[PDB]
Amino acid sequence: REVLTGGHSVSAPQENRIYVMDSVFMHLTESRVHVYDYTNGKFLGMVPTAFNGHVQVSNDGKKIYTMTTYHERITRGKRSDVVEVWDADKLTFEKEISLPPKRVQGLNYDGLFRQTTDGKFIVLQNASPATSIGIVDVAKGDYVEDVTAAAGCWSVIPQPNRPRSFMTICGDGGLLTINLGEDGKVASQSRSKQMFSVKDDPIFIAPALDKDKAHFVSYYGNVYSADFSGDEVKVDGPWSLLNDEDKAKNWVPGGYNLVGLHRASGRMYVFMHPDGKEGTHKFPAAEIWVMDTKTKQRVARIPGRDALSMTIDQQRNLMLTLDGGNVNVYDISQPEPKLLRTIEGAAEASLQVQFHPVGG
């Protein structure tokens, strides 16, 4: 005889796992995270995330965090905005953390749902539509701070060289840095000088994030940087991604989570398309460009496979790209990315894929 059993853990090691956040925009109340093995394309499991879920994996690899909204009767009744903590290996629900009813409802940019480098606090974007940043203490299972200093700013860029620090992009074209105390309350803050012109050269919010600096690309193909090796962030730019030939064909960036940095080499990866003009900033990639951030010059270009979003794994030297439904796995140990495989039908409507963390 056979017996059906539950209680099982994911069949593949953590190090093989990726997380495809499927918004299922056509039926956005049944968004979910699909868990895949990037080495062979196998579907490993999933986590339901109700209306417009967001997802991240804990820095220690042990837990999955989701953020979502419920109502008592879905389309009517009382609203509950929550963070949920799930076990990463069992893909089971463990804890709900109550949020104020203003968590960001929107497309899955990384910077809307992040955590401190030390993993002790979840850092999330609120919009009521007034903006602020919310802080959740994971251990306590509590919402502990509301950073109103961040009004008029958007998205969270953690600083990997500090335990509980992050930046946000503000309407003045500068960056606000927030350093949290060990209680999750703001311990200090600082504001940079203006980095970019909001009106003349808007940047994409997606950072190409190094340990001690972040690069940003603009609608017009320029690059800006924020160096946070010290307590005060130093900002610079623009330099152009484009040479004269590139300019002749109106190449510009486009996508959502559209950039990545390979920290060991300084290579930055950007989705690009020709015939850029007003309104093309979210167009699929015609190409992926590989930029040497030290020399400020392109080193390679490859077909983009209509990708919109990417993510990088530092330790295995991989880049994933995602066109909404399919995930492409690339080896980036050398300057030219090599396509290893495509996982077809990984999602119906995903703009975000993430690796399971292995760094700790």
Partner: protein, 120 residues
Amino acid sequence: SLNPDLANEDEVNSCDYWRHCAVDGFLCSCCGGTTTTCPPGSTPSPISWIGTCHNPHDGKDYLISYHDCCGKTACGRCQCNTQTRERPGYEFFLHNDVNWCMANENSTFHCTTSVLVGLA
């Protein structure tokens, strides 16, 4: 050009209709409503993203308010993702990758539209 209710439905239900120039979502006029009326049983958003669209028929620029209708599950029809003059969340009211139903009594997103405010 300024009166969609007088135009051919196939024209207004298209993502290239001039006033739909920063729409992210399902056009309410394909969902049992019109360009300026929510489908039955869905509620207008009190807030919206905004922006200007050029009217090629009369050659003028117009201010558009992109309100959502809310409180019903996704319409699913006539999905558009046009981005003329759309900007990221640090210019929040020009941004269309957020749910402008976010402050409604029920935030479930149903459909979107493009409400003519006036000359730019």
